[PDB]
Amino acid sequence: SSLPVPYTLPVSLPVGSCVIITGTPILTFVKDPQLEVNFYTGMDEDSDIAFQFRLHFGHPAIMNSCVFGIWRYEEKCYYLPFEDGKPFELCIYVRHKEYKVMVNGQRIYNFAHRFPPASVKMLQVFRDISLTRVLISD
Amino acid sequence: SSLPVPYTLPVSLPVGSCVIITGTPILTFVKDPQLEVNFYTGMDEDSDIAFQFRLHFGHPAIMNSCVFGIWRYEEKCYYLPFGKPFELCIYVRHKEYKVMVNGQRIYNFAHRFPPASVKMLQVFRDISLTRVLISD
Numbered sequence: 001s002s003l004p005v006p007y008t009l010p011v012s013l014p015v016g017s018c019v020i021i022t023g024t025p026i027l028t029f030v031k032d033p034q035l036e037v038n039f040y041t042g043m044d045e046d047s048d049i050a051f052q053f054r055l056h057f058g059h060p061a062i063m064n065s066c067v068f069g070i071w072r073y074e075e076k077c078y079y080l081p082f083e084d085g086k087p088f089e090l091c092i093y094v095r096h097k098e099y100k101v102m103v104n105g106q107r108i109y110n111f112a113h114r115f116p117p118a119s120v121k122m123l124q125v126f127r128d129i130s131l132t133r134v135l136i137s138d
Numbered sequence: 139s140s141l142p143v144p145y146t147l148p149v150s151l152p153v154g155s156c157v158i159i160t161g162t163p164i165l166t167f168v169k170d171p172q173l174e175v176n177f178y179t180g181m182d183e184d185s186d187i188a189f190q191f192r193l194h195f196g197h198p199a200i201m202n203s204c205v206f207g208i209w210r211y212e213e214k215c216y217y218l219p220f221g222k223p224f225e226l227c228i229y230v231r232h233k234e235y236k237v238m239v240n241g242q243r244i245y246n247f248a249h250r251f252p253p254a255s256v257k258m259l260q261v262f263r264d265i266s267l268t269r270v271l272i273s274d
């Protein structure tokens with residue numbers, strides 16, 4: 001199983017459900033490879049986004065100088081160790097108050113709802129990933 | 139064993155020298171573990187910094203909402219998987235520093251001060267430091 005990218009899917013995300021997204025980072029085309037996941041409150045792509053999750057597959061490295069006490073122009077790059085992306089499982093579990101965000105089974109964040117989870121109507125997954133599965137589990 | 143952190147060291151950085159820093163990241167005490175290396179142009183706390191290298195050991199993740207076409211308050215965290223020991227080499231060339239992590243060149247930083255202006259090295263934040271040396 002392999003899915004097109006960008007991937008768009010009508011969804012219903014009640015409390016207790018989890019959005020499972022598995023894939024592999026593609027590190028060979030862009031300098032800052034990332035994964036982006038959007039929960040839309042409607043079906044047009046000008047509808048509101050109740051929740052966006054963006055994950056950078058590299059490590060940020062930031063370089064600058066400080067002259068007269070003032071930090072100057074920041075130069076940034078993304079350190080990519082290994083050019084084989086590690087496969088990942090993204091799990092977004094829907095709780096009453098928040099989305100519980102898990103990467104490879106490890107909770108990294110709890111994003112408090114800014115819309116009722118019932119208002120989410122569509123999911124979009126795209127950028128620098130080879131997509132293996134996208135499903136709604138309970 | 140670990141060298142003291144912060145680690146501060148008077149240095150001379152001629153073209154052709156490399157700043158070699160090895161150590162292991164410490165991932166268990168702060169949400170955003172980093173390594174910070176500063177090249178100072180004098181020996182004082184207030185001195186100018188000719189070059190700062192800051193590396194995040196985690197993967198940044200950013201979350202937000204978009205309402206009425208406007209992105210709102212961005213919420214940020216860092217995914218820390220699995221730290222493996224690292225080697226950072228900052229190679230001093232005529233026109234730039236060549237930044238090397240684990241033997242991989244990741245960036246060429248154009249000099250903003252003459253590298254002869256650098257007088258002091260400082261290394262600190264979330265690392266167990268193994269070696270700091272300058273080799274020519």
Ligand SMILES: OC[C@H]1O[C@@H](O[C@H]2[C@H](O)[C@@H](O)[C@@H](O)O[C@@H]2CO)[C@H](O)[C@@H](O)[C@H]1O
Nearest residue numbers: 062063064065071072073074075190192
């Ligand atoms: O660029 C080096 C300096 O950055 C400062 O933090 C930056 C930071 O990189 C950025 O994300 C922004 O949001 O805040 C600061 C820019 O004003 C550090 O505090 C400073 O010590 C230097 O590292």
Ligand SMILES: OC[C@H]1O[C@@H](O[C@H]2[C@H](O)[C@@H](O)[C@H](O)O[C@@H]2CO)[C@H](O)[C@@H](O)[C@H]1O
Nearest residue numbers: 036052054200201202203208209210212
């Ligand atoms: O929340 C991330 C958000 O960034 C967008 O670009 C923004 C950005 O928030 C900001 O730096 C600046 O003000 O311009 C844009 C509008 O605010 C991305 O377009 C979007 O996909 C998100 O990733």
